[PDB]
């Protein structure tokens, strides 16, 4: 019962059109700036606790830092209203970002009945997702996502993948700006990406030991990258640069621009 | 069975004299540089996991950032050795700091049999501890300790309080260097400090609702600060600047330099 309201956010005046997503912490809404007609995703996060406050501001900071990359949703603005000032009786945080076309799974559902995904489509989806995570892992210190899953991936208005969910992410604070090149979590993200790749090819989750279908002749080109990302030993497991590198070579060999629109999800 | 060993740490060569503290993650040792004869605390942290790696490096970063303050142990150096190179079969992190005289509780035990602590001694111990936490809360972003307890407090060679345990601490990463003055955890630290003050005066923990003794004529000057730090509502609860400010005025009124040595713990 928050839809219908027009909300002030800086110099913006936004009509809350409908509910895109919910869960525990928060809701996300489709919103439209009344005057300019531009559309946005608006996440509204309620807090009664300083621990919630900290998690919420950390998510905003991560979104701010990662913005600008073609495969991360664009951060537009953020703002709050004190609990004394809201009709929740709670602190409200407002986070305004790029409105996407929808969740990637919705589109995968619809493609699915028309049969397996083209190798090329799998390549584009996976590369674009790996580029977004590479962007996080390249930060100083690296930002570890920790909740990579296909359901959280979005498809942008241009048909490219957009990573949006930084509420589980973490890294080192007050990092000095002495020597250190230690893994601090990246490799759990890679495992997660391995599951996504498996899932895109074979349309099930590799766990709940895994198994690439023994006679698969369509996604064979991905098999060794899958196994490499699903090494149980994390030192053996690939880095994101090791995954991206291989994805670039696969792309160059198939004459595919892997950052291009995934127009087959848009038909 | 790590005591006896001489360990290399940069250009330092340190003899591991004995075990000061242990627990889960780690051990802390008394160590002596063979050549210069200077003494240190040496914490050795074992890791088989990237999550442990991250927690460990975060503790080191916090120690680095907070160093220089008279009431935080001084960070001297840090270093690692890969799991392939150690006789644990695990990554080892070495953290070298100021060797203190001992834990504050040891000294409190010994004072205790000689009767209540002077108001002045309570003032010095509490102020000095609050100055260390103020130093954390003043960082940008603020560093939240989250495990303030009297057992973790140390007494320095000069007779002043030294805070050392930053393994539970946290704050916001990739903080932008837009507006925000939200509590993110400070107030739970203040509650913890309130318990410490109560404990120093009345030699028991206020919980496991609390109760300042109804006829106390010795620590009356602290009573309203206690209640103020133990507000159940965290917006009502004082900030560290609000606590330190009052402690300065109490000190000025009793003609006490509250940062001076606590020479009565040293008799
Ligand atoms: O930024 C977003 N743009 C979006 O379109 C979007 C966003 C987010 C989102 C927004 C802020 C933080 C985390 C997720 C969640 C979202 N769940 C969604 C569910 C359906 C949908 O069409 C879009 C989103 C969505
Ligand atoms: O830095 C320290 N100097 C110390 O004297 C010290 C330190 C620490 C410590 C060191 C690194 C990280 C966290 C705690 C723990 C410690 N437990 C201790 C227990 C007894 C003691 O006499 C000293 C310490 C001690």
Numbering used by the authors:
A (entry chain A), B (entry chain A): 27 to 203, 234 to 264, 275 to 333
What text comes from the article?
GAK (cyclin G-associated kinase) is a member of the NAK (numb-associated kinase) family, which in humans also includes STK16 (serine/threonine kinase 16)/MPSK1 (myristoylated and palmitoylated serine/threonine kinase 1), AAK1 (adaptor-associated kinase 1) and BIKE [BMP2 (bone morphogenetic protein 2)-inducible kinase]. GAK was originally identified as an association partner of cyclin G and CDK5 (cyclin-dependent kinase 5). It is essential for clathrin trafficking, mediating binding of clathrin to the plasma membrane and the trans-Golgi network, and regulating receptor signalling by influencing trafficking downstream of clathrin-coated vesicles. In addition to its role in the cytoplasm, GAK has important functions in the nucleus. It is required for the maintenance of proper centrosome maturation and progression through mitosis. Overall, GAK adopts the typical bi-lobal kinase architecture with most of the structural elements characteristic of kinases in both the N- and C-lobes highly maintained.
The asymmetric unit of the primitive monoclinic P21 crystals of GAK–NbGAK_1 contained two molecules of the complex, whereas the GAK–NbGAK_4 complex crystals exhibited a C-centred monoclinic C2 lattice comprising only one complex in the asymmetric unit. The GAK–NbGAK_4 complex showed a similar dimeric arrangement as observed in the apo structure with large portions of the activation segment and the αG helix (residues 265–274) disordered. In contrast, the rather surface-filled CDRs of NbGAK_4 favour the shallower flat binding cavity created by helices αH and αI. The dimeric assembly of GAK is a phenomenon not only observed in the apo form, but also in the crystals of the GAK–NbGAK_4 complex. The complex of GAK with NbGAK_4 traps the catalytic domain in an inactive conformation, in which the activation segment exerts a domain-swap conformation. The engaged and partly unfolded activation segment in GAK in combination with the disordered αG leave the front of the active site with a large void that precludes the formation of a binding groove for substrates. In order to provide insight into the binding modes of some of the identified inhibitors, several inhibitors were used in co-crystallization, but only two compounds, the Wee1/Chk1 kinase inhibitor and indirubin E804 which produced ~72% and ~90% GAK inhibition at 10 μM respectively, yielded crystals that enabled successful structure determination. The Wee1/Chk1 inhibitor binds with its phenyl ring located deep towards the back pocket. The planar carbazole core is placed along the kinase hinge where it forms hydrogen-bond networks between the pyrolidine-dione moiety to the Thr123 side chain, and the carbonyl and amine main chain atoms of Glu124 and Cys126 respectively. The hydroxy group at the other end of the carbazole core interacts with the Cys126 carbonyl atom via a water molecule.
